[PDB]
Every structure is written in C-alpha cells, then in structure tokens.
C-alpha cells in the first residue's frame, strides 16, 4: 500500500501547486509601479553600547521601546538603557553556549537557551533585589535555537531536533509539541495577536502553526538553502524569510505563494536577520557581507545601506514605536541607528 | 542629574564587574575533542582526571585545560560548528583496531573547514596493541585495498599516520601524531607540549614577526 500512498501524496502536491499557480494574476511589482520611491535613507549612529567581550548572538527590544537585552558567548545577559546607555542588570548564565534570548512583554522575565538543551527563565522583579532562576525547562534532545514569550505564563520554543514545543512555565511541562520538520528549526516569530506562529527550518521550508490547536496549517517552500530568519508584516497577513542563498523573499498568508524576491547581483553572503519597519514600507535585512541593507518592501530596490560594523551582523530589531533600529554583530558592538 | 547619579554608579560598578570577569576568564586553555564514535574518546577524557555538551576542566602544569566533548549533539555540524572557533587546538581520536573510511572522511571535512583554516590538530591513535594483534591475525590490506609492502606493525602504523597526515593543505597548521594503547599515562604530556608549541606559533603570528 506504500505505492498507493506515494501516488496520493504526489497528486496532492500537484494539486497544491496548481492551486497556488492559479491564484496568481499579477505580481506585487506590477501594482506598486506608479508610487513614488522612498529615496535615499540616511541613518546615523546615535548611540553605541560597548559592554560585551564575545560574539553577540541575539538581542531583543523592550515593550516600552527603552529597555534592551543582549546575550553573548561570554556567559552574560546584560539589560541596556537605550536613552542613556546605562546598564541596569548583568545576569551570569550557567552555560556560556547561548544562541537566543527573549524579553517578556510585561518586563518581569528574561529567557535564555542554547547548546545546553535547557530553556532558563529568570525573575527580574524579585523582592530580595537580585535575579533568581525561576525555572529550567528541559525536554529537548537538541540545541534550542529560538524562544519567544507568549505571555508571563507560557512560552514557545524552537529546537534543533526538528521539533517545536509549547511550554508551561508554571509547572515546566510540554503542554503541546509541534512536529513535521525534516531539519533543524533555526527561526520563529509570533503573531501580533499571539494566536499563531511560523517556523523556519533548515530544509528550505517554512510552516504555519497555531499555538492553540497544535497542528501545522500551510507550508511555504520557495528557497534553495537553510532559512536563517523570519518576521511577520505589521498587519499580520504576510512574512519575510531570509535564507543562505543571498536572497530574502516575501510570502503572503492569504495568497499562499510568493510576492517578490529581494536580490542583487553584487550580493553573495547569506541573510542572518530580517526585520520590518513600523509602517511596513522598509524591510531591513542583515547580511554576512558586513553590511545591513535597507530594502524597499514595495519597490524591491535598495534605498540605502547601514555600514559601520567590523564583522557579520547576528541580529537586528526595530523598536515597538518605530523610533530607532538596533543591530548586534560578532565584534561585540551594539549600535542604535536613527 | 538629581537621582540618576546612583543609576550611573550602579552601571559603572557592574561594568567593572564585567571587565574583571572577562580578564579572569581569558586565561583558560580551550580544546575541542572530536573523532569517530566508540573510538576511545571516553577513555582519554576519563584518563586525564574528571547531555548536549560535556565539559571536563582540569589543571596541568599551571595550564587550565577546558576540554569540550561535544559528541552528544546528533545534529547538523554546520549550524553550530562556527562557535567553536578561536579554540587553541582540536583533538582527534581514532580507534586503530577497527570505522576507518568514516574517520578519514571526518578528518578531511574538519581539517579543511572555513573556520578552522589556522587551528592545528592533535591526532591520537589509541588501541595500538589491539591493532598489532589484529595484524598478527589478519592483514592490514582489508581496510586499505591499495596498501603494498611488508605486513609489520610498524609499517602499518606509519602508513596510517601518513594517510591521515596527508589530508591537510594549509601552510599555517601542522598535524601532531602520537601512538598510544590507552594503558598509559602519557596522554597528558603530549597535549601539553603540543599546546605550548601552538601558543608560541600564535604569539609569533600575532606579533607580526612570524
């Protein structure tokens, strides 16, 4: 019965491809051809935060657009003040092999994970004054690549063992697990309403999950290599995925196919981080080519470059109010542009 | 500045703490241990004293060796191998008794890697007496079809050493080979002298005189 099942799968894939092709009547570039370009975007370094001594691997913005947490291989996770460049907290990690960090929306907790296969939650607003490890989620057999706080109680984590699992910080048990990826899942992003999320695996595919039901919904495969970053549009109906093929693409949830590709002839390094602007008109992507390029989300052309980093940029993030952008790199320097 | 001066004082204090921690932690000697499965890695990591990554730190002649046994990560190497750069040396362990084509392929993959173009490899060959007994029982031509010569233990060992050492191409790194039977306490001095030589080479390169 294996042959019949294989034939059924092949015909289902053919039907899916035909349906995706049929919905395409005009590309995004064909409709946004009569709008004025945004012009040259000149961004200057306003602040520089020099606290880390190792390669910075992840960073996150605060919900008030003022606080920022940064994690590096030195085994520390510092909390930054963007307006005054002061340091509020310095949390020492148990394992120095850290590859992700998250900041709670309410500002009470900070997550951390890496090669130790355990997600560690820290408590900031403690009555004794110091920061204490509130929980240690240990259920994964592979390195944890991403973790995002859904709320103060439950957190979703993406792991390198081809699995994604929703946790419960109250009791530390896997409430729900998401399976289906063939390779390592190295990216994750939550919806504005925290009702659904997508994962970007190393098998050049992206899947659409929902936290409540716990089943995959749609699969977007257009890339040719490992997907390193992902992020939704502010409206919540589209997302952009950057891969190692030196190109980042725009996918539409409702159209269920591609919209445009953001590639240049003089670009060879793979994408490391992708982020959107507050209005969604500017798509800033980090490159392994030592520079950050600002892409026009509707015109598919370069509006400027963010140069000034001595190494590969590992992470980038736009504030909640859209005021500034922060970029972290492997030379242990974090820069705020405006 | 009314009461933000206390915040500035706190920030300066924790910045000083970070600097002190970095200076204190910069003195550790890092080593990466690789090799095929069931090749005696556990024997050597338990021979010099003391689930994802297993770190075994010990002190020998004022050198704090931080040895990372990362064999527990059954995933794609390319997605996490880049964080192990800046390591002093790579220890490579291979079982001479058995599991040899895989070892050669792994050595070729790890010696020509982009991030490890300057890190020298300290290669170990344990189970010498098991290999000698097997030679006395079976010829060494079974593993290598293209091996021609006398079937002595020394000849076979030298041939395997040459085949392993010929895989490198970068002028800036050298392969250190040693013979062991795992029934010995000499697996710590070899690492020590190789690490000292690598330190001298790195210092000479950094000063620009090399």
């Amino acid at each position, epitope marked *: 019965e294996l042959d019949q099942l294989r034939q059924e799968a092949e015909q289902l894939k053919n039907q899916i491809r035909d349906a995706r092709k049929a919905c395409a009547d005009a590309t995004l570039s064909q409709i946004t051809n009569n709008i004025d370009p945004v012009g040259r975007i000149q961004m200057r370094t306003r602040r520089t935060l020099r606290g880390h001594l190792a390669k910075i691997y992840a960073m996150h913005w605060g919900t008030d657009s003022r606080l920022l947490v940064s994690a590096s291989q030195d085994g520390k996770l510092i909390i930054w003040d963007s307006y005054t460049t002061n340091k*509020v907290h310095a949390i020492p990690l148990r394992s120095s092999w850290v590859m992700t960090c998250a900041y709670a929306p309410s500002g009470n907790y900070v997550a951390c994970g890496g090669l130790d296969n355990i997600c560690s939650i820290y408590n900031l607003k403690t009555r*004794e004054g110091n920061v204490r490890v509130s929980r240690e989620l240990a259920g994964h057999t592979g390195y944890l690549s991403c973790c995002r706080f859904l709320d103060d109680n439950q957190i979703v984590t993406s792991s390198g063992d081809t699995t994604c699992a929703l946790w419960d910080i109250e009791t530390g048990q896997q409430t729900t697990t998401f399976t289906g990826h063939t390779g390592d899942v190295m990216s994750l992003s939550l919806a504005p309403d925290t009702r659904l999320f997508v994962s970007g695996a190393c098998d050049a595919s992206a899947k659409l999950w929902d936290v409540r039901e716990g089943m995959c919904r749609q699969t977007f495969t257009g890339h040719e290599s490992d997907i390193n970053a992902i992020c939704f549009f502010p409206n919540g109906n589209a997302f952009a995925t950057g891969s190692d093929d030196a190109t980042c693409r725009l996918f539409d949830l409702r159209a269920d196919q591609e919209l445009m590709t953001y590639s240049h002839d003089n670009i060879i390094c793979g994408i490391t981080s992708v982020s959107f602007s507050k209005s969604g008109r500017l798509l800033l992507a980090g490159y392994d080519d030592f520079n950050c390029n600002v892409w026009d989300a509707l015109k598919a052309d370069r509006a400027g470059v963010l140069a000034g980093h001595d190494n590969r940029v590992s992470c980038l993030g736009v504030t909640d109010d859209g005021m500034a952008v922060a970029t972290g790199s492997w030379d242990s320097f974090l820069k705020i542009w405006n | 500045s*009314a009461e933000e001066r206390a915040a500035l004082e706190r920030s300066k204090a924790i910045e000083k703490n970070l600097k002190e921690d970095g200076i204190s932690a910069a003195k550790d000697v890092k080593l990466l241990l690789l090799g095929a499965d069931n090749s005696g890695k556990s024997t050597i990591v338990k021979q010099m004293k003391i689930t994802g990554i297993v770190e075994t730190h010990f002190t020998f002649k004022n050198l704090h060796f931080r040895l990372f046994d990362v064999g527990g990560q059954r995933s794609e190497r390319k997605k996490w191998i880049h964080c192990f750069e800046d390591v002093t040396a790579i220890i490579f362990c291979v079982d001479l008794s058995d599991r040899m084509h895989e070892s050669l392929m792994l050595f070729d993959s790890i010696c020509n890697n982009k991030f490890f173009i300057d890190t020298s490899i300290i290669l170990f060959l344990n189970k010498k007496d098991l290999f000698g007994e097997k030679i006395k029982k079976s010829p060494l031509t079974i593993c290598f079809p293209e091996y021609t010569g006398p079937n002595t233990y020394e000849d076979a060992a030298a041939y395997i050493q040459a085949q392993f050492e010929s895989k490198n191409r970068s002028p800036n790194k050298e392969i250190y080979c040693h013979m062991t039977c795992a029934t010995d306490t000499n697996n710590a001095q070899v690492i020590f002298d190789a690490v000292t030589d690598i330190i001298i080479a790195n210092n000479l390169r950094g000063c620009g005189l090399y």
Partner: single-chain antibody
Amino acid sequence: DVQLVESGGGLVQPGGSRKLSCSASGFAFSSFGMHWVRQAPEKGLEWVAYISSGSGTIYYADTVKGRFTISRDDPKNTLFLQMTSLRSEDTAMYYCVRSIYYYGSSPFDFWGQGTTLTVSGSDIVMTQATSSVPVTPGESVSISCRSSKSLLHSNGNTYLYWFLQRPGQSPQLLIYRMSNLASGVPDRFSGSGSGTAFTLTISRLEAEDVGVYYCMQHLEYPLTFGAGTKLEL
C-alpha cells in the same frame, strides 16, 4: 522574609555617645543603599544621613554634619551610625530604610522597627496646609502638600513621596514619584499633582487606614519632610 531589626538605644547622658546597629537579613544587603530617619516624640519625621551602595557617597543634614557618621558592614549585613556629642534635642526613635536605585526602582520601600533614644537657606520648604482632619469610614479624604520649588525635572519625573504611619507601627511607602503605587498597597490609594501643588486621594477609607500621612521630596539632598496631616476616626 525581609527583616530589618535594629537595636542599641537607651537612656544616654548629655554630651555622651551611642553606637547603633541595624541588622539586616533576607535580602541582598550589598546592593542596597541605607538611610537613617528619626522622629521626635510629638513632631514629624526628619532625614538624618545616607550611605550608598558600595559606600560611595555619604550625605548629612544641616543639624547632623560633623557630629554623626554613617558606615556599613556588607559582609556582616549591618548598618552602623556612630553619633557623638548628644544635645538635648536629639531624642527620637531612629529607623532603618533601604532605598535601592535604578530605572524603575522603588526607593524607601521597606522600613525598620526603631530604637527609642531618651536623651537627658536654599533648602526646599515643603508644607502641608492642614495638620488634622476628621474622617469617617466609607468617605473620601484628600490630603494636599505644597512645595516651594518646582519638583518636575527636565526628564519628566516629579519626585514626591507619600508615607503612612499607623499608630504603634513604622511608616509604609504608598506612592513613589507622585504617581506610582508601591507594591502591596491597596488600589484605593491614588496620587496626583502638577509641579508645585500635589494631592493624594483616598477612596473608601477603612478603619485600618487611620494614621498620619507625610509628604516627601527626593529632588536633592537634604530631604525635607512635610508637616504631617493626621486623619483620626
């Protein structure tokens, strides 16, 4: 839990000396700045001294500099106040306060118990107009406290503090920075103001809310307390 027990108070002859200890336990004493607050038998509170985290900065009041000195012992988790040349006006019951400072912190959150000590120009003048108000349960009471200077700094934060001292107990922080409610305080307490004139609103006053209410500013040292409006049943 958090405990600040202090002792070393008693009858002292005039012109003598006395050494006071503030034992602390249950919290990280090393990163907390400690104050010293006294209270006259029939008057309000009066700031005395201050030591910072790491023994960086030390300040004294106008009537305190030179005679007194404040020191801490971080490994022993104790705060010390060597006070010398006791005059007749130094009688009070001295408190111990922890005031950790950072962005979003809550200074003056926890107060000590107190030791009785029976002894034989440009500063901000902060005054409360009314010193006594009669209240009844179920009603709303509002207390006002005017400041001589403008307390609103250029960064947008006004430094006004509100405290409540129940009969026979120690003062408890209620409002910090004139708009933020301290942790543990019931939500019925609210505060407001604009630059110079400040007011605090109490809704659905209960029998446990009886006491004397003080207003305090933290703009610059020295710190001046208010006259103290007393609300009685």
